[PDB]
Write an enzyme that holds these catalytic residues in place. Structure first.
Site, PDB file in Angstrom:
ATOM      1  N   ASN A 140      -8.482 -18.768  -8.838  1.00 36.61           N
ATOM      2  CA  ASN A 140     -10.291 -18.226  -9.581  1.00 36.61           C
ATOM      3  C   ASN A 140      -9.458 -16.648  -9.233  1.00 36.61           C
ATOM      4  O   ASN A 140     -10.371 -15.584  -9.467  1.00 36.61           O
ATOM      5  CB  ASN A 140     -11.045 -19.001  -8.395  1.00 36.61           C
ATOM      6  CG  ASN A 140     -11.920 -18.704  -8.574  1.00 36.61           C
ATOM      7  OD1 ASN A 140     -13.075 -18.261  -8.460  1.00 36.61           O
ATOM      8  ND2 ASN A 140     -12.796 -19.832  -9.662  1.00 36.61           N
TER       9      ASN A 140
ATOM     10  N   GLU B 205       0.649  -1.354   0.253  1.00 36.70           N
ATOM     11  CA  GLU B 205       0.129   0.159   0.078  1.00 36.70           C
ATOM     12  C   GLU B 205       0.891   0.927  -0.272  1.00 36.70           C
ATOM     13  O   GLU B 205       0.928   2.812  -0.404  1.00 36.70           O
ATOM     14  CB  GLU B 205      -0.939   0.091   1.249  1.00 36.70           C
ATOM     15  CG  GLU B 205      -2.377   0.704   0.873  1.00 36.70           C
ATOM     16  CD  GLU B 205      -3.687  -0.008   0.740  1.00 36.70           C
ATOM     17  OE1 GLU B 205      -3.602  -1.717   0.729  1.00 36.70           O
ATOM     18  OE2 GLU B 205      -4.213   0.294  -0.636  1.00 36.70           O
TER      19      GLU B 205
ATOM     20  N   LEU C  14      -6.715   7.661   9.635  1.00 37.36           N
ATOM     21  CA  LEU C  14      -7.452   8.847   9.462  1.00 37.36           C
ATOM     22  C   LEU C  14      -6.912   9.509  11.423  1.00 37.36           C
ATOM     23  O   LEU C  14      -7.081   8.775  12.296  1.00 37.36           O
ATOM     24  CB  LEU C  14      -8.563   8.975   9.865  1.00 37.36           C
ATOM     25  CG  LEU C  14      -9.539   9.572   9.170  1.00 37.36           C
ATOM     26  CD1 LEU C  14      -9.211  10.412   8.157  1.00 37.36           C
ATOM     27  CD2 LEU C  14     -11.049   8.915   9.261  1.00 37.36           C
TER      28      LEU C  14
ATOM     29  N   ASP D  41      -6.352  12.075   2.459  1.00 40.67           N
ATOM     30  CA  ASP D  41      -6.599  11.304   1.374  1.00 40.67           C
ATOM     31  C   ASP D  41      -7.767  11.041   0.591  1.00 40.67           C
ATOM     32  O   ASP D  41      -8.091  12.673   0.187  1.00 40.67           O
ATOM     33  CB  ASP D  41      -7.549  10.167   2.113  1.00 40.67           C
ATOM     34  CG  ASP D  41      -9.075  10.617   3.094  1.00 40.67           C
ATOM     35  OD1 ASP D  41      -9.694  12.054   2.744  1.00 40.67           O
ATOM     36  OD2 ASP D  41      -8.564  10.451   5.044  1.00 40.67           O
TER      37      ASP D  41
ATOM     38  N   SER E  61     -13.969 -18.291  -4.489  1.00 37.82           N
ATOM     39  CA  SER E  61     -12.487 -18.036  -3.961  1.00 37.82           C
ATOM     40  C   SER E  61     -12.347 -18.673  -1.943  1.00 37.82           C
ATOM     41  O   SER E  61     -11.006 -18.708  -1.741  1.00 37.82           O
ATOM     42  CB  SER E  61     -11.382 -16.740  -3.701  1.00 37.82           C
ATOM     43  OG  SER E  61     -11.698 -16.870  -5.526  1.00 37.82           O
TER      44      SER E  61
ATOM     45  N   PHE F 226      -7.982  -4.457   3.479  1.00 40.29           N
ATOM     46  CA  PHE F 226      -7.569  -2.849   3.221  1.00 40.29           C
ATOM     47  C   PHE F 226      -7.780  -1.961   1.645  1.00 40.29           C
ATOM     48  O   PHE F 226      -7.684  -1.392   1.927  1.00 40.29           O
ATOM     49  CB  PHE F 226      -5.799  -2.651   4.165  1.00 40.29           C
ATOM     50  CG  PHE F 226      -5.706  -2.951   5.018  1.00 40.29           C
ATOM     51  CD1 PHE F 226      -6.166  -1.441   5.441  1.00 40.29           C
ATOM     52  CD2 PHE F 226      -5.199  -3.286   6.234  1.00 40.29           C
ATOM     53  CE1 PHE F 226      -5.822  -0.987   6.796  1.00 40.29           C
ATOM     54  CE2 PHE F 226      -5.274  -2.804   7.110  1.00 40.29           C
ATOM     55  CZ  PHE F 226      -5.676  -1.821   7.754  1.00 40.29           C
TER      56      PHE F 226
END
Ligand SMILES: CCCCCCCC/C=C\CCCCCCCC(=O)O
Ligand SMILES: CCCCCCCC/C=C\CCCCCCCC(=O)O
Ligand SMILES: CCCCCCCC/C=C\CCCCCCCC(=O)O
Ligand SMILES: CCCCCCCC/C=C\CCCCCCCC(=O)O
Length: 415
Positions: free
Chosen positions: A243, A122, A143, A131, A228, A215
């Protein structure tokens, strides 16, 4: 003279404490023989069996203290009274705090891996940013405030970190901020019925992969991978890999999806980039030797002596009780802290749950012991009953469930 004589005279207390101590000794011997005979069973060999023996010796000494407090007029017994009533809780809680500290360190090192994974995937910014929704954020999407003040964001950041950050943190501070986010995400998972069954039926690495997926897209979006997720639940990693490779998320973010899928498949951190045993014995030995040195220093300062009865009354004042009680209470407080920080750990068939409940009960019992014992006119019997009760709550909340699993559920005794 004799507890039976005191029972015949009208006092139903000394013989009762003797029976309590005898039952406690028999129970301790039973549990110890069970844990020795079944030392190789996975439920016993998974925890610190040596620290378990230390705790069992502490319980046994706490029960034997009654035979020191209710004994014949001798000097060595006035010595062994202090020795036992000081070292039994010490011997138990030193090993217990070593165990809980190792568990907390294991939990921290486990969260470090998820932090590294989502730092690779990330990203992270050590300075405050906003954000896409337009709210103050720092680190890996943490946050700060919904309010539109940069000074308010810095205020909450300083309040969460504990230093004058001035809108800049470090990687370890970002990891501390990320631990709360992963806790909140896991809470969100365990409340949704479309993600919790898979999350509970996985190992740590695949749990981390699912956390990464949550996330990236959110719990509602991750819940879309129904087939899945069911493949992962049934331990069909090779089929779930394909898959998931067929997904639109894989075609929009391929580089991160490849690593997440490889993690789900192999079950190792090989896709990405990222406490001893004899040491615990020595640490518990040092923590017990501190209490023993306190006891010897009080022996030297205030020598034991019969004041002057089935009670061997000694010259034990209040300081000779306060100091060992204080050290044992500090041990109990550290134990409770490290066992509460690990209260939800499922290792050793959720051993930390029983550990934390035992620590809660011990804290309550000691907070009640202070005004009960110090405002009492029958101090020896109250000390007997209190030490026996602490040993009993320990042995019953921590060791009775294990013996029950061993001697009644031999099929659940599997890793
Ligand atoms: C589950 C197994 C049983 C557990 C409970 C055992 C109860 C034992 C209680 C105390 C035994 C009686 C105490 C001895 C009385 C002495 C008086 C006398 O002998 O004159
Ligand atoms: C005579 C006193 C009471 C005896 C009954 C209690 C026996 C167990 C006592 C404490 C348990 C820890 C001591 C022994 C540890 C295990 C022995 C070993 O593994 O070699
Ligand atoms: C089933 C377990 C309990 C069985 C009954 C046991 C109670 C009676 C046993 C003897 C108690 C003797 C304790 C020693 C203290 C007396 C010494 C003294 O007062 O000077
Ligand atoms: C792992 C902990 C083991 C503890 C077992 C019991 C501890 C007994 C240790 C030694 C007791 C020595 C006390 C000093 C004797 C009295 C002489 C004096 O202090 O003046």
């Amino acid at each position: 003279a004799s507890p039976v004589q005191y029972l015949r005279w009208g006092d139903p207390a000394p013989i009762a404490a003797v029976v309590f101590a005898c039952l406690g000794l028999l129970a301790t011997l039973f549990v110890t023989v069970v844990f020795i005979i079944y030392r190789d069973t996975p439920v016993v060999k998974s925890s610190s069996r040596e620290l378990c023996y230390i705790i069992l010796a502490g319980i046994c000494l706490g029960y034997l203290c009654t035979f020191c407090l209710i004994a014949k007029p001798k000097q060595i017994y006035c010595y062994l009274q202090r020795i036992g009533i000081g070292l039994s809780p010490a011997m138990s809680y030193s090993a217990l705090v070593t165990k809980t500290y190792r568990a907390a360190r294991i939990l921290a090192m486990s969260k470090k891996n998820i932090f590294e994974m989502l730092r690779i995937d990330e990203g992270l910014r050590l300075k405050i940013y906003k954000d896409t929704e337009g709210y103050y954020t720092i680190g890996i999407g943490h946050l700060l405030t919904k309010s539109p003040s940069l000074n308010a964001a810095k205020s909450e950041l300083d309040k969460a970190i504990g230093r004058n950050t001035n809108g800049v943190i470090t990687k370890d501070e970002a990891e501390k901020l990320f631990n709360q986010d992963v806790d909140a995400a896991v809470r969100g998972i365990l409340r949704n019925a479309k993600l919790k069954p898979v999350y509970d039926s996985l190992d740590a690495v695949r749990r981390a992969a699912l956390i990464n997926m949550v996330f990236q897209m959110g719990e509602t979006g991750v819940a879309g991978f129904t087939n899945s997720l069911r493949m992962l639940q049934q331990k069909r990693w090779d089929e779930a890999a394909v898959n998931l490779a067929k997904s639109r998320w894989y075609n929009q973010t391929p580089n991160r999806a490849k690593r997440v899928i490889t993690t789900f498949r192999t079950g190792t951190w090989d896709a990405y980039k990222i406490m001893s045993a004899c040491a615990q014995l020595v640490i518990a030995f040092i923590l017990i030797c501190i209490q023993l040195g306190i006891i010897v220093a009080l022996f030297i300062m205030e020598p034991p002596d019969i004041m002057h009865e089935v009670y061997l009354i000694c010259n034990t004042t209040n300081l000779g009780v306060v100091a060992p009680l204080g050290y044992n209470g500090l041990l109990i407080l550290a134990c409770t802290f490290y066992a509460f920080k690990t209260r939800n750990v499922p290792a050793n068939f959720n051993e930390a749950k029983y550990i934390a409940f035992t620590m809660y009960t011990t804290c309550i019992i000691w907070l009640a012991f202070v005004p009960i014992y110090f405002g009492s006119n029958y101090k020896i019997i109250t000390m007997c009953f209190s030490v026996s009760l602490s040993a009993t709550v320990a042995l019953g909340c921590m060791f009775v469930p294990k013996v029950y699993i061993i001697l009644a559920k031999p099929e659940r005794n599997v890793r």
